[PDB]
Amino acid sequence: SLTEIEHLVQSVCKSYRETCQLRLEDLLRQRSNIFSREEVTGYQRKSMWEMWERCAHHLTEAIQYVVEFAKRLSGFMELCQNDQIVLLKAGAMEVVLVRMCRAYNADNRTVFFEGKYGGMELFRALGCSELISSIFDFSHSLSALHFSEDEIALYTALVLINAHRPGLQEKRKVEQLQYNLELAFHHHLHKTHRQSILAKLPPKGKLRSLCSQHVERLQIFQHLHPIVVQAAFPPLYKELFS
Numbered sequence: 001s002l003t004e005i006e007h008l009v010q011s012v013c014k015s016y017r018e019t020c021q022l023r024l025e026d027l028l029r030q031r032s033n034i035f036s037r038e039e040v041t042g043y044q045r046k047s048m049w050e051m052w053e054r055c056a057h058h059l060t061e062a063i064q065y066v067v068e069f070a071k072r073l074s075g076f077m078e079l080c081q082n083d084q085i086v087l088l089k090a091g092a093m094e095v096v097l098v099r100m101c102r103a104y105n106a107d108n109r110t111v112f113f114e115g116k117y118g119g120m121e122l123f124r125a126l127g128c129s130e131l132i133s134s135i136f137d138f139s140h141s142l143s144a145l146h147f148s149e150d151e152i153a154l155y156t157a158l159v160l161i162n163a164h165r166p167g168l169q170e171k172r173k174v175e176q177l178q179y180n181l182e183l184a185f186h187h188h189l190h191k192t193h194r195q196s197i198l199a200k201l202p203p204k205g206k207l208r209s210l211c212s213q214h215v216e217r218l219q220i221f222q223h224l225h226p227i228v229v230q231a232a233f234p235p236l237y238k239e240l241f242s
């Protein structure tokens, strides 16, 4: 079923186009739009907890777009609800972190944040400099690959659809979706002469560890200073919030 695989590609890429938040062309064109030193100081002088509220709300929105991404993947809504939640709990923030590389400019080590590009020093008030450095470093590694939009879409589909996540109830059903996505990704890389990126993808455990550290810090902040969430997915919200 060759066209089936070429189908799944178009459908992962449609889901991705509909949920990617900002077009790559817009992110690239704005690269010259950089926060001034005056604007940087304004962010650095904000309360920890206001910077936390702003960042938490951008991240909640990013997670919701990833959930919509998964929901639009052919086969995902046919998984049982338990397995949908297991997969999204384990992988949605991993996908958010990967998606960040599109908004990262390796030339000056800046990220697109609230309308302009700024470096790590923008986030000083959060007092999380080690975690922020790890996020910038990771985006720097991914940015060297020059990910195309379909590569990010297919790669992040596989971040989510991982039959190894503990707690799955219909593991063979997740495996079938995983195998088809893997074939789609590998067929696409062969067609575009891009198989060389396979050896350059983040090693096993590196995205897991960064995401673990990230979510753990978000949980600490939410314990100290809870944000109000525009909750759209009750079964998933209930797994992350208490």
Ligand SMILES: O=C(O)c1ccc(OCc2c(-c3c(Cl)cccc3C(F)(F)F)noc2-c2cc[nH]c2)cc1F
Residues within 6 Å of the ligand: 056, 057, 059, 060, 061, 063, 064, 088, 089, 090, 091, 092, 093, 215, 218, 219, 222, 227, 229, 230, 231, 232, 233, 234, 236, 237, 238, 240, 241
């Ligand atoms: O709309 C919803 O129903 C809905 C459900 C869950 C959700 O979870 C976000 C989330 C967060 C997070 C964020 Cl983004 C900001 C502040 C605090 C937290 C934390 F840590 F307290 F949970 N961290 O990890 C995840 C996650 C989700 C899937 N895997 C990981 C967000 C939603 F909008």
